[PDB]
Structure formats: C-alpha cells, structure tokens
Amino acid sequence: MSLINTKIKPFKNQAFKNGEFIEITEKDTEGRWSVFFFYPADFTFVCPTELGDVADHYEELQKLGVDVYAVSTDTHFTHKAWHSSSETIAKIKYAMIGDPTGALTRNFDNMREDEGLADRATFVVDPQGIIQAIEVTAEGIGRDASDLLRKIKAAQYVASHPGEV
Amino acid sequence: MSLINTKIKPFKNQAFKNGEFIEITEKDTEGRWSVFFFYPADFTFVCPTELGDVADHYEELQKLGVDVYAVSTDTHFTHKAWHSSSETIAKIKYAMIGDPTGALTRNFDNMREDEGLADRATFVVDPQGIIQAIEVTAEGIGRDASDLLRKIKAAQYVASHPGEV
Amino acid sequence: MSLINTKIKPFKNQAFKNGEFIEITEKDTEGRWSVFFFYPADFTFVCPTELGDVADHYEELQKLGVDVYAVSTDTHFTHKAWHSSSETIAKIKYAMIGDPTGALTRNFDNMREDEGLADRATFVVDPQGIIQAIEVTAEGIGRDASDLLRKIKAAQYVASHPGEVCP
Amino acid sequence: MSLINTKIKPFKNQAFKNGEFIEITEKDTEGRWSVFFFYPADFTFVCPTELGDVADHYEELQKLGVDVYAVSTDTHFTHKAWHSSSETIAKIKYAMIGDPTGALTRNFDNMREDEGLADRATFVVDPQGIIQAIEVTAEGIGRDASDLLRKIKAAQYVASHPGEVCP
Amino acid sequence: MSLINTKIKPFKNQAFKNGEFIEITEKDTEGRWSVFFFYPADFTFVCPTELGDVADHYEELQKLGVDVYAVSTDTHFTHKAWHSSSETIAKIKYAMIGDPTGALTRNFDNMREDEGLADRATFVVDPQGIIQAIEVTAEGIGRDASDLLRKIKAAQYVASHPGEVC
Amino acid sequence: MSLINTKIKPFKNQAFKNGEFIEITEKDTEGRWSVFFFYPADFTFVCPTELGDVADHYEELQKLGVDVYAVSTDTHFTHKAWHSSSETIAKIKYAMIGDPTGALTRNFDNMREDEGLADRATFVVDPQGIIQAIEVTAEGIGRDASDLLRKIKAAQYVASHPGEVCP
Amino acid sequence: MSLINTKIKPFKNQAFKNGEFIEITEKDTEGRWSVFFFYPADFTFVCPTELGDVADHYEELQKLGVDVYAVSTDTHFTHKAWHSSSETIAKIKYAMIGDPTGALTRNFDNMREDEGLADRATFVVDPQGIIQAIEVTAEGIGRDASDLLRKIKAAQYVASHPGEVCP
Amino acid sequence: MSLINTKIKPFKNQAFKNGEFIEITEKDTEGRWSVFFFYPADFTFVCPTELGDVADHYEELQKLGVDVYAVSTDTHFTHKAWHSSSETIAKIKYAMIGDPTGALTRNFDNMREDEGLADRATFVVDPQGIIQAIEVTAEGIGRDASDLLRKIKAAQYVASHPGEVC
Amino acid sequence: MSLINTKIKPFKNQAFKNGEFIEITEKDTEGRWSVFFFYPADFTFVCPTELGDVADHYEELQKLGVDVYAVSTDTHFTHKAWHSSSETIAKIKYAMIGDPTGALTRNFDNMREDEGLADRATFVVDPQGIIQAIEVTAEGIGRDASDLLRKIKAAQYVASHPGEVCP
Amino acid sequence: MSLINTKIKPFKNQAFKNGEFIEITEKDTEGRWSVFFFYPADFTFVCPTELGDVADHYEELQKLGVDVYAVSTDTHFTHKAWHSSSETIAKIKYAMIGDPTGALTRNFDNMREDEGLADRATFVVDPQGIIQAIEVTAEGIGRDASDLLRKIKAAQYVASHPGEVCP
C-alpha cells in the first residue's frame, strides 16, 4: 500500500534552525504546507547541491506559505556543526531535523535497514496533513528544486480549484 | 518497506504499440533501461499533457537506449481506440500496456483499491531490473518529462562511474 | 451454492446513460424488475450484436417495467467514448455501468480471474431483489434477446400467479 | 470464480439407461460433446416439458455427436420407476444419473442447500471437458431445447473454426 | 461420544402419510413415544421385510401411544410413488419422511457420506425427547419388529416404575 | 459419524476368563467373529439377566465360531470376585475384560463421561474387523440374546452370500 | 509444581460408609481435619494391611476430629462388595469413596494414566482445606498408620501454636 | 502427573562431606540406593531434629547400601560453616548438597517459588533410579527417620522378592 | 535496553542489620540515596576486601545521606552467622539483604543463571528511584569504594545543580 | 541475565582511524585485549574529557597489548569531522566506530530506545572474547581512565594466574 494521499503520522523530533535548537511535531505542520526532505547522512563526500538548491528557493517557498523540513538520521548537534562547517549548508535557513531513533523516517517508509540511514525522498504535505506528492531517488541521482516548486504550485491550484479541465 | 533499489517482479501483460498488439514481460526489460509510466484511466477529461510530453522526448530516450511503458488498468483494446481518437495520444510510439487484472500495478504498490485504478507514478529501472528512481503525484499535479530525462542521465552516469565526488 | 433464488448483493458503481454520468446502487433496483447484462470489454473487435439486440427490445422492456444494466470491468469514461465511436452502441438508451474494482462482477460470481474481465452472463432480478434466471455463455456463443424477453414474461407470470403452474 | 471456460470435475455416479443400470464417470465424457441437464426431483406435480423436449431432439443431438445426461438428487432406482410410471419420461433414451450424495450437483455449483435438491441448470461441455455454455432458471421458468440446440451448433462451429465472426 | 440418553435435535421435514403430504417437526414428537426408522433408499431390489414387519405391528404401537417415522434420503414424492407401486409398502399407515438435505439423518449420526444414503438404524425416543434405545445394522442384516416391540414395552415400564431394583 | 461398517481400533486389555487372567488384543479378534458386550458396572443391584442370557447361548455361539467379550470399566480383579460372588455370573465361560483406563470403551464411543462408566452397548465384528451390527439401550432396557444370535446368523449369511436378491 | 501447602480442589463423589451409600463433597471437609487415603484397586491379591491399620486408629482419629476418606478408581458398589467379602475391610467404619471418572484422583495428581488406577498416596488436609502432609509409596511398600497419626498431632500442634522456637 | 515410580533427572551439584568439598551427579547414584533429604534453609531457629535423626541412623543405612544426600538451596560453603557451628549438624557424616540454582530441587518438584527455598521432602531412589517412596511435610511437621528406615527395608524386600502375593 | 536512567523495580526481602532481622522494600529507598552492592556468596575463600572497604566509608556515606544495601543469593539467616564468624564482616553496620528467590538480583539483571549466584555489581540509586551509576566486575577484579564515593558526590552535584559543566 | 562473563556477539561496522576509514569486526578483536568505549553523540556541548583521558593513556594501553574502540550511534563521516573540529578529539589515535544501525550497541544492551543513542558504558574484553569488566554511568558522571587501567591490569593478572587470588 502506497503512502500517496494518506495523512502523516505524529512525531516528536529536535532540530536546528538558524542557529537555534527547536522541537517540531505534527502539530506544527497543521494549517501549513509542509515539505519533508529526507537525505542519508551529514559530512558525506557527495555534493550537497540538493540542499543548496532548496535554500535558494526558500524565499519563494515562504511567500507561498510553505515550510521546509530537512530530515536525516544524524543528531541535531551534528546539523549545527555541518551548518557552520560547510559553505553550501550555511545558506539554509529552514529546520534541519535529527532522527537518531529513525521514527520519523519509518513513518514515511524510507529507511535503509542495512545502513541505518534514510533514502533520498521528498514529500509534499497539505494543511490537512495528506501527502500530495512523493519523489524518491537512488544515490548519485539528484532531485530538482525548480521541479519541486512546480509540483507545489500545482498542488495549491488543485486544492483551490477542484475538477479543472 | 520501500520499493527503491529493489528488483522488479515478473509479469505478463498485453499492450498496444504503433498500431500493433504485443505482449511484454519482465524478460523484455532485461539488459535495457526501462521507464514504467503509470496513470489512472483513459478517455478522462483531464489533459494528457504528461503522456504527450514523454512522446516528445521519446526520440531522445531511444538514443540513450531507454524503453518506455505506459501502464493503466484499462484494456489494450481501449488504448488502441484512445490512440486513434485523441490527437495528443496519436503522438506516442511507445508501448501502452493494459492491466485489467491490476497485477502489474500491484507489483509496484500503486493501486487505488477503492477506485480500482492506478496512481500517478513513474519508475526508472536499470538493465539489472533494480528500481533507481520513483515519482508519485496526486491528481492535477503533473510530472515533468525534462526532469525525468535528467534523472535517467544521472542514473546512467552513476552506473558508469561508482563513487564520484 | 447456486446463485439462483438469492437476493442481489449491495453495490455502488458509476455509469453512463444518455450522454451524462450517474451513480447506480441496489437502492435503484428495488421495487423494479432489473436485468444485469455482463460483457468482457469495450472496443473489442468482436461485434456487439448481443448489446445492440437488447437496445432494439429496450422499448418493449421499459413498457414491461424492466430496467437494463450493461456491466463491464472498463471505466464509465470508456463507455461514453464507445457510445460515440460505434453505431451499434449509439442505439443504447440504458445505463452502462463501469466496474474497475470488479466488486459488482464478483457479487454475481462472474469474473475471469486470469484476464480480469467479466464473463458473458445475463441475470434477471425481480422487484424483491431475488434472481430468477441466469444465462452464461463462452466467447463467440451469442445470447438471444427474444429468448430473454420470453424468460422475463414467464418470470412476471409466475410472480403474478404463484404456485399456479402446469395443470 | 465463474464455471464458464473451466474443465469439469471428476465423478462416479450410477445411472439408468434403456431399462438397465450403468456407471458413468468423467472418463465417459472424454472426446465427446456432453450436455448435463439438472432438475430438482422425480414424481413432482410439475409437468416435465423440459425432459420431454430434449427427448424429442435426442435423435438430432446423437447425429451431432452429443451425449445427454439428465441429473437429479434422487436415486437411479427411482429414475427406473419414474420411467415406467410417466409416459413423458418413457420417451427418454439417454442416461438418467442419480446423485444422492450431491457431489456431481455441487461440482457444478447447482445445489439448493436448504432443500437438498438440484436447481434447473443446463451445461454444455466440449470433448476437452471445458464448459462452453450455462443456463439456469427458477421453478416455473422453462428452458427450450431449440435454443440449446442452436447454442451447441454455435459451440461446435467456434471449436472447428476459430477466428470468427463479425467485426 | 454416544447418542444414547440424549435429547433429539430439532428438524423440519416433509412426509407422506395415507395418501396426503404433511410436515413433521420435533414439536410433533413432544409428549409422545416416537420411533425413527431409517432405511437407505426406495425402489431397491432388496426385500422390504423390515418395513412390512413394522406395518403389521403398527396397530399394537398406536395402542401403546407410539408414533412411527420411516425416514430416508429420498423425497416425499417418491414415497408416494413407492406406496402405490409395491404391495408391501401399501401396508404402511405411518408417516414416510423424506430427507433430501440429510439434516434429520445427520442429527442421528446415521449417514453414509460416500453413498449419500442413510444407514439402516432404528431409534426409540420417549415423550421428553431422550433416546432410550438404538439399533444399527449393515446391509442384508434384518431388524426384528417383535424385538423392537419388546424394547419399547421395557422402556415404558422403566419410565413408569423407576428404581425397581430387579 | 457412525461406527457402523468400520474396522475396530487396536487395544490391549487384561481380562478374566474361566478362573484365570489373560491379555486380550485386537490380534485375537482377527480371523474370527467377535461380540463386544458393554455394561456399566459390577456388583450393581440391577439383575444381570443380560450377561446370564448370553452365557446360555455361549455353547451355541462357539459352534458358529463366535467369541464373546464382556467389557466394563471395572478391573479384571473385580470380575473374578463378581464371578465367585453371584450365581448368574458363575455361568460365564467367556472373557470378562476390564477397562479401568477406558480406552477400549472410548474406541467404540460408548463412555458416560460424567459417570465414568460404559453405556449398555453390544457390537458384532466380522473376521475382517468391520462392525456389522450395533445395539445400544438405556438403563433398565434389556438386550435379547436370541435376537443377537439371529443377527449374527444373518451377518454370517451375507458374508458368505454377497448380494442376495429375493424373488 | 508441588501440591504441599495448597487448598484442595472441589469434587462430588459417591461413597460407601457403614452399610449405606452417601455423597461426599469438598463442603464436607470444611471446618474439619481430613485424610485422603488413595489405593489402586479393590479385590487385589495384595494384603490390605494399610486399610486395616487405619481402621484400628479410626476410633482415635475421630477423637482428634479427623475424618478419613479411602479413595479408589473402583465404583462404590464394588466397595460395598469388598466390605462384605474381606474380613480386614469389614473393620472399616470410615467412608470408602469411588472415583470411576478419576476426577478426585487427578485433583491430587495421583493417577497411573497408562494403568487407569490411583497411586498409593496419603494426604492430610486441615480445616482451611490446605494440604499439610503428603506420603506416596510404590507397590509393596507399606504406609504406617502410627506415623500418620503422629504427623496429624504435629499438624494440629503447629496450627494451634504458630512459630514455636525450641530453646 | 505424579513423581512416584519415575526415573530421577540428571544433575550436577557441589556438596560438602566430612570437611571436604565434592561434586555429586546422577552417575554417583547409579547401582546404589539413594535418599534425597530436602530441607528449606541453614542457620534457621527451627530445631534440626530431622537431620540429627538421620545422622544417628546413617550407620544403619550404610550397612543396607544406602547413600544419603541432604539438599538445600544454600551454597555448599554455608553447609561447611553450619557443620562447624552447630553440634547437631556436627553429627552429619553424609553429603550436604548445595543447590543455589534450584535445578536439583526443581527436578523433584519441591520448590517454594515465592520463598526461593526447598520444601521439606524425602525421596527414596533405587539402584535403577526409580523413585519408590515420597514424603512431604509442612513447616513444624517432623519427619521420622525410623519410619523412613522401615520404608527402605520394605522397598529392598519387594525388589528382591517381587510378586510375593501377601 | 540498559538499566541506566531507569526506575528500580519493587521488591520485598528479609535482611540482617546490627544483630536483628528486618524487612526491606522499595518504599524504604524512597526519598533517599541508595547503594545496592551485589556479591556472589557468603563463606567463600575469597577475601572480602570489597565488603570491608564500604564498611570503612559507611560513616562517610551516612553523612551524605546514602543508605547501603549488601545483597546476595544466600539467606538472611546465613548473613547473621557470617557476621559473627568473620572479623571483616563484623565491621558491617549496614543491611545485609538475603535473596534466595533471586527476584531482587534479577530485577538488576545480575544473575549467574548457571551458578545461581549474583555477579559483583554495584548500583547507585537517587531519591526518585532512578539508577545513576552501574559497575560490574568479574571474579578477582576488585571494586574500590573511593571511586564509588566520588561517583556518588558527582551524582548528588548533578541532581542539585543541573546545566553543567565543561563546554 | 548479566552480560558479564559472556562472549561478545559478532558485528560488522565502519570506523575512522588516523585520517582513513576502516572496517572492524569481531575477527579483529580475537587474540587481543579489547576495550569498547560507548558514548551517546558527536558534537555535543558536554566536554569529551572522558574520550580525551583515554587518548592520554592509549600509549600505555598499546604497550599492555590493549586495543581501544570508541563507539557511537553517529556515522563514521561525523567521526572524521569531529576529529578535525575539536582539539581533544584530535588526540584520538584509536578507531572511532559508527553504529547508525545500533546493532553493536544492542549487542552490549546499551541503547537508549527513546533517544536512539548509546549510554555511557565501558567494557573490557579478553582475547577469548569474554567480557571481564563493565562500567555504566549517567549523563554528567565521569569515567576515570586511571581506574580503567587498574581494572585492565587486574584482568591480565587473573588471566595469567588463574585461581590464585587472595591468600
């Protein structure tokens, strides 16, 4: 059974956001468009072009009323260090959630059970909590932020206008 | 458990391809890059911009050595009629698979069990049979063919060069 | 476990009738004689002589107080397209139900599980919902509408005169 | 889970035919067209027009290479007595199978479980054993043999010459 | 797991009695001694000596306040035909129950599953519904009606005079 | 499920016979007619008319090649005492089996579970081990040995002469 | 799991006592010291020295307020016969319980399952129903009534005088 | 579900015997009469009359070819301390087994689960390993060694002279 | 599933303290710092340096408001005898708990299942009942009380003043 | 179910050591003294005094023939970053294992299931693989490396002189 068009499960995770630690839950996503951006690990040799691309469009997403949540199995302590260490990660101003339990990752059925890391997946959730769009990729295959931006605009248009030609 | 990075299951489905009925199986996908394009139904009032967009890039995909498989719960008899009826569907020259049993749709966990139709999903499969990229969307939210094209080129680059910076 | 002389199971399917879509249920059948006409698929190369033959007698069936329900595993969107495409299907004035779930087909135990299509079966249901006549045929074997009419008239005769047969 | 286009299940029943008892199995039906004719009970007040109709066409069915098997839940001993009793049943020259177990009746899914009798169903089986036509009716609703004969000729035509007919 | 000294299960069966069809249930057996006489089938070549014997003793049984119920897997329509056909069955004044479902036969655990016919068994049921005597035999083995009559008289004596210690 | 026309289950019980103890098994019943005579208990106040009646016919039964086995849930030690105690039981020359475990009683489905005693049942078994006749009665209802003797002669006749049809 | 220091399970058995039958239950043991004396069978060739030894001390046990219950898997009818038969058993004035169902024997976990008889066990139960002493032996090994009497006096002493510490 | 007439389960336990530690197993009991004497605990205020009685009769038991094994849930280290401490326990010449695991106690179904101590029970085991006599009592109830001695002699007589019918 | 940072499970054990027996439960540890000190057995040849070390620091622990509980699988009766026997154990003024059930030992997951003795483990529990420090060693490896004392002072400091220390 | 004196379970984890990644298994530990040092997370604000204190004594441990294994639930990619970031972690010359699965942490029963991080535990393993010493502490309570060294030397002394303690 697919996760498309289903309500997101509850959670409690700590996160790093613009130099301050915070706690996000499913309560925070209510009445807001949410974007859960899963990625495997921090401090990897792979280019963080995907996270940096979303950082560029984050001003645009905030104007649409869309929150962004970068998720990974590393701790939020690690996210703070990787923000200060890397130049590309310094650009992001959205919440970077840590999921050492893996609970939030397993809610979206997105766990590499052998590696203990999250697969590369992007989810789009409406104010009601229902998942409207999913995108999963293998390693080395990037996901485009401008493509994501179009999918969100389409989702907001459908919620506004049911049954268009 | 996710379908990402798993081998595709076996199948036997009839299909319509450039004016001729044919039978495709998992044997045909072996040694070839395959793209399974799921969509709910034929003769709907919704614009088939997604199928028409892939038709434009089909010349380009064939040069990369990539086969395309449009899948739906309607019969292959219905696919022939919709090819002759519609102008946008007349453009496609790839196989349009019919899945009235739903077996091929349920192999990819992509069934609307209430409606008896397939969800809007796109899959990318390598010559080995392993799924490298997944994209699922709700109705009204289109998927971009140029975005898909980039994800395939990336997948072929990774298969060629393991462990790039 | 014969399916004859049993009350029809409840259902909720979308259908196409006279250029507009409608929702049909078991609530619509009660209080009226119903005829569920199953066929495997739309846009098949085999002729719809059976479907067109019922369309000719539909004026007589409506006069008798009998509704007709053409059922198939295709969508109602296809039923609209196949109505405009073919001449024989353009004669159809009754509802053409779509059953992509197969639920309505499985209620009558009439599903080809391998193919995922309905078998060629015709059922006659009284106002109470009880099935009084069944006719199932293989591919290529035609179902006569004139014989169907005779069975309907016989069923209505027995309903009007219960236990008054063969003296 | 329809019985149409499926191979018949094996059986072993006693039967009465032309003044002597015989044992009939699924092996007797092999390589030959068979017609299983079910009816509820013997010595009923209902007129056996359906049994008599097939008896008239039996000479014509034997020319087509078609065997007929009348089946009921009564014993083969009972069938012999009903042959000597009624003048309509005296016309019967085909085998009258007794099915007190109900096994043969339940193989065709044609048992009135609460009554312990078979329903009025007619089946057409090809030499391969595959069921090509089914016809079930309620009490009082007659099954005409002329339509059955037409269905058999159609079935034999499709088996002989696949790839037809109308486009 | 025996069937002796147990209350009979409820049932609904059609039967033929003196040129007329009737419906018997467990309600009809209440407040009366009953005798369920199972036999395999009608119109068989085997001698109907067993049913003919009970027909002779039926006058005696009706005096004792005992009803007789001949049960079989054949229909009640056949019982009527077999009554007019045979001269031995013409002596039958008691009810001939038809059990095509087999439910009544299955209540007494007396069914040949592979044959679909009832085994030749005899049961004696008191007014309370409790089974007091059981007799089962194989094909060709005769059941004596005079011995049955003796058992019924003994059953009625014990019910009337319980705890008489010899 | 009926026990008529079924092979007896295997057993190993201790028994008292003719002033000495012996062990009886299903091996002893092979190739011989056997009669299993169940009764509830020893030293009861009820008159043992049933056991004494069989003892009178035991001389005749041995000429027919028939063994008798009186079974009960009491010990074989108790049977020896009851043989010496009562004058009616002193007539018995056949084996008196004790079944304190109740295994042999439960093989014939003849146990009063709440009481822990056997019901009054009599079984006739042929040399093959198949049960040909069953007779069960309630307390106070006597079982006739003359009728039992008659049933055995009928059983031996049918075994020797299969399928006798009377003219 | 040990049965020592546990409340006895409920039961309802028929027993022979002093020339007449009676029904014993767990209700009868309430508010009184009880002694359950198990032995395998009646009319055995083994000398009943154990039962006769308790009969000698029964006069003394009744002064202590102690009831005795001789239990066995034989019927109470058999106990009456064995009371009249043997001279050693004629001494017994306490209740001789019969347990053909074996329920009371299995309450004390004292059944030879393969044999269908009780083992040689003796239990001492206080007014509360709690088991204070257990004594089990094999065949041929005698149980002393004098030692049993001593154990009861010790049990009554401890019940009256809890936690006695010797200086 | 009784423990009478059943072969003893195998075991491995440390024990104290005559100022020296030893390891006893089921192998040591083979070909010899054994007496497993369970008691709850060491250093208790209750009188050790039961163990003292067996110590007096131990010479008699060794003549009969009978070994004695005093078992308890305490360690064998404590048994040594309790041997030197008390004067009644100083009479003990037989082995004092320690069973802190409780395995040997659980083999005889003789454990107070909530207390974690063994119930006061006595067992008599023949050379074959079969249990011939069992005796269990509650706290404060004395076990007689002279009666135990009588049972052992009776057990040896029956083994020697089986089927002597009086 | 670590025991660190978890509330201790409830118990009820007998113990010896200053020449008299007492019952200790989880309720006695409430509102007070507790130290559960496990060791395998009494009267062992191994030198009790670890027991003696804590006895020297017990006066210092009582000032900090810390109770000490020496635990083993031996009985509380045994602990009394070992107190009078050894001169090192004579220094003990804290409670010596006996755990013959092993329940208290198994609550801390500290049982040598094959030996039936406790392992050499030391636990530190706060007034809330939460375990703040664990230390387990093998046979021969000593646990020093000076390090334990330091760990307790650190635990009391963190409880008093959260938010430390080094960045 | 104490974890002391048990053979360590097999594992396969990635690790960081001296600026390069390596794979460590139970195969690497056998034949050598090993020390598994668990800590909850990298880049925590709390000081790594415990981790730096072991780095000071690592020259002495390598001389004693002892390997050190720092374990945590973070990736080995973070261990490399935290090595370059902090001064105290730059002193680390031994392997720092990553355990994102938590498998290695769950082998030692040292997982905070709520937080998904390892508890502060230190284990000492001999060449045979048997665990000889365990030390677990809460957050804020320091683990002394000088005390750890003493336990190691004690474990090696007992291994060299088995059963030669405390005379």
For every residue of E136-147, DSSP letters joined together read: EE-TTPPPPHHH
d(C-alpha D61, C-alpha D21), whole Å? 22
Other beta carbons within 10 Å of C4: 21
CB C101 within 8 A of CB B101: no
Contact indicator for A36, A50 with CB cutoff of 8 Å: no
CB of F99 within 8 Å of a chain G CB? The answer is yes
Residue pair E134/F134 in contact (Cβ under 8 Å)? The answer is yes
CB F58 within 8 A of CB F89: no
Q: Which of A158, A164, A136, A149 is nearest to A63 (CA)?
A: A149
C71 near C37, Cβ under 8 Å? yes
D160 touches chain C (CB under 8 A): no
How many whole angstroms separate alpha carbon C21 and alpha carbon C23? 7
Let me know the angle formed at the C-alpha of D96 by D93 and D102, rounded to the nearest 5 degrees. Answer: 170
Contact J6/I at CB under 8 A: no
- Residue J129: C-alpha distances to residues A153, B122, J99 (Å): 60, 51, 20
CA distance G121 to chain H (A): 9
Contact assessment for residue B79 and residue B37, using Cβ atoms and an 8 Å cutoff: no
Query: Count of CB atoms within 10 A of residue F157's CB?
Result: 13
Distance (Å) of CA E111 to CA A142, E51, E103? 73, 19, 9
- Dihedral of alpha carbons J70, J71, J72, J76, sign: positive
Nearest to G76 by CA among F50, F45, F13: F45
Question: Domain count of chain I?
Answer: 1
> What are chain E's partners, defined as 3 or more CB pairs within 8 angstroms?
D, F
Round to whole Å and give the CA distance between E110 and G136: 48
| Helical axes B49-64 vs B145-160, angle rounded to 10° | 30
Helix (H) or strand (E) segment spanning residue B15: strand B12-17
The counts of H helices and E strands in chain J are 6, 9
Dihedrals phi, psi of H115, to nearest 5 degrees? -95, -25
Which residues neighbour A107 within 8 Å (Cβ) at sequence distance 6 or greater? A8, A9, A11
D105 — phi, psi (to 5°)?
-70, -40
| Distance from C-alpha of I143 to C-alpha of I136, rounded to nearest angstrom | 8
Q: How many CB atoms lie within 10 A of CB I2?
A: 22
Intra-chain end-to-end CA distance of chain H, in Å = 29
Whether the bond between D165 and the residue before it is cis, its omega within 30 degrees of 0, is yes
Helix, strand, or coil (residue B131): strand
Contact C122, C19 (CB under 8 A): no
Question: Which of F50, F105, F136, F165 best probes binding to E when mutated, by most E CB atoms within 10 angstroms?
Answer: F136
Query: H95-98 and H66-72: which strand pairing?
Result: parallel
Q: Which amino acid is at I41?
A: A
Distance of CA G145 to the CA centre of its chain: 11
First to last CA, chain A: 29
Interchain contact, B100 vs C41, CB within 8 Å: yes
Which residues, 6+ apart, have CB-to-CB distance to H63 below 8 Å? none
How far does I20 lie from chain J, in Å, by closest CA? 30
The residue length of chain E stands at 166
Taking CA atoms, D155 is separated from C143, D158, G5, in Å, by 12, 5, 84
| Amino acid in the structure at residue G91 | K
Strands A12-17 and A117-118: unpaired
- Whether J81 and A43 have beta carbons less than 8 Å apart is answered as yes
Q: ω before I165 within 30° of 0 (cis)?
A: yes
Interstrand relation of J66-72 and G95-98 (parallel, antiparallel or unpaired): unpaired
C-beta of residue F118 within 8 angstroms of C-beta of residue F44 = no
Half-sphere exposure (Cβ direction) of E65: Cα atoms closer than 13 Å: 10
**Chain A interface, best mutation among B136, B143, B146, B150, by max A CB count within 10 A:** B136
Query: Mutating which of E147, E148, E153, E164 best tests the F interface, going by the most F Cβ atoms within 10 A?
Result: E147
The yes-or-no reply on F/C contact (3 CB pairs or more, < 8 Å) is no
What CATH code is carried by the domain that includes residue G74?
Answer: 3.40.30.10
Pairing type for strands B20-25 and B12-17 reads antiparallel
Is B16 near chain C, with CB under 8 Å? no
Tell me the torsion sign for CA atoms A129, A134, A138, A143. negative
Positive or negative CA dihedral for G144, G146, G150, G156?
positive
SS (H, E, C) H127-164: CCCEEEEEEEECCCCCCCHHHHHHHHHHHHHHHHCCCC
Could you tell me the residue range of the domain that residue H89 belongs to? 1-166
Binary contact (E81, D81; C-beta < 8 A): yes
Nearest CA in chain G to H162: G140
- Does residue I133 belong to the interface with chain J, where contact is any CB pair within 8 Å? yes
Contact list in E for residue F110 (CB cut-off 8 A) is 2
- F16/G90 Cα distance (integer angstroms): 26
Under an 8 A CB cutoff, do B100 and C115 touch? yes
Residue listed under structure tokens 């794979």: J23
Helix axis angle for D49-64 and D145-160, nearest 10°, is 30
Cα gap H154→H148, rounded to integer Å: 10
Angle at H116 between CA H111 and CA H118, to 5 degrees: 40
Catalytic residue (one of I47, I62, I101, I112): I47
Chain G contact present for H149, CB below 8 A: no
In the stretch 48-87 of chain C, residues with CB closer than 8 A to chain D read 49
The verdict on a CB contact (< 8 Å) between J117 and A100 is yes
- Would you give the end-to-end CA distance of chain B in angstroms? 29
| Residues making up chain G, counted from first to last | 167
Helix (H, G, I), strand (E, B) or coil at D103: helix
Instruction: Residue I107: list chain J partners with CB under 8 A.
Output: none
Residues of D in contact with E42 (CB under 8 A): 75, 77-78, 81
Alpha-helix residue ranges (DSSP H) falling in C65-144: 76-85, 87-90, 103-107
CB atoms within 10 A of CB G166: 8
With CA atoms as reference, the chain E residue closest to D79 would be E43
A156 close to J (CB below 8 A):
no
Cα D146 to chain centroid, rounded: 15
- Alpha-helical (H) ranges within chain G are 49-63, 76-85, 103-107, 145-160
**How many angstroms separate the CA atoms of F94 and F68, rounded?**
6
The first and second tokens of residue J18, run together, are: 């001296």
Helix ranges (DSSP H) in E1-144:
49-56, 58-64, 76-85, 103-107
Q: What would the two tokens of residue E15 be?
A: 């039967």
Give the strand pairing for B117-118 and B120-125.
unpaired
Residue B122: partners with Cβ closer than 8 Å, 6 or more residues away: B35, B36, B37, B38, B133, B134, B135, B136, B143, B148
* DSSP classification of residue I41: -
Distances (CA, A) of D60 to D71, D145, D157: 20, 11, 16
Q: Do B80 and C43 touch (CB under 8 A)?
A: yes
Coil, helix or strand at residue F32: coil
How buried is C156 (Cβ within 10 angstroms: 0-12 exposed, 13-18 middle, 19+ buried)?
middle
- Write down the residue that tokens 């195998």 correspond to: H10
Phi-psi region of E74 (alpha: psi -120 to 50; beta: other; left: phi over 0): beta
Size of chain D, expressed as the number of residues it contains: 167
DSSP of J42-77, one letter per residue? SS-SS--HHHHHHHHHHHHHHHHTEEEEEEESS-HH
Q: Contacts of residue H150 in chain G, CB cutoff 8 Å?
A: 142, 144
B47 is catalytic: yes
Q: Do chains F and G touch (3 or more CB pairs under 8 A)?
A: yes
Name subunits touching D (3+ CB pairs < 8 A): C, E
**Nearest one of J90, J96, J147, J145 to J118, comparing CA atoms:** J96
Give the SS3 label for residue I111: strand
Of F78, F80, F116, the CB nearest to G78: F78
Alpha helices of J65-144 — where are they, by DSSP H? 76-85, 87-90, 103-107
Q: Radius of gyration of chain C from Cα atoms?
A: 15
Question: Would the CB atoms of D2 and C120 count as touching at under 8 Å?
Answer: no
Q: Please spell the DSSP secondary structure of I126-140, one letter per residue.
A: -TTSBEEEEEEE-TT
* Cα G115 to Cα F151: distance, rounded to the nearest angstrom: 35
3-state helix, strand, coil in chain C (%, to 5): 35, 30, 40
Please state, in angstroms and rounded to a whole number, the distance separating the CA atoms of residues F26 and F103. Answer: 13
Q: Shortest CB distance from B44 goes to which of C42, C77, C115?
A: C77
The dihedral region occupied by B7, where left means phi > 0, alpha psi between -120 and 50, and beta the remainder, is: beta
CA geometry: angle J54, J58, J60, nearest 5 deg: 120
CB pairs under 8 A between F and G: 64
SS3 at position H5: coil
Burial class (CB in 10 A: 0-12, 13-18, 19+), A113: exposed
For residues E120 and E40, is the Cβ–Cβ distance under 8 A?
Answer: yes
Residue A127 is encoded by which pair of tokens? 């104010």
Question: Which residues from chain F sit within 8 angstroms of residue G139, using beta carbons?
Answer: none
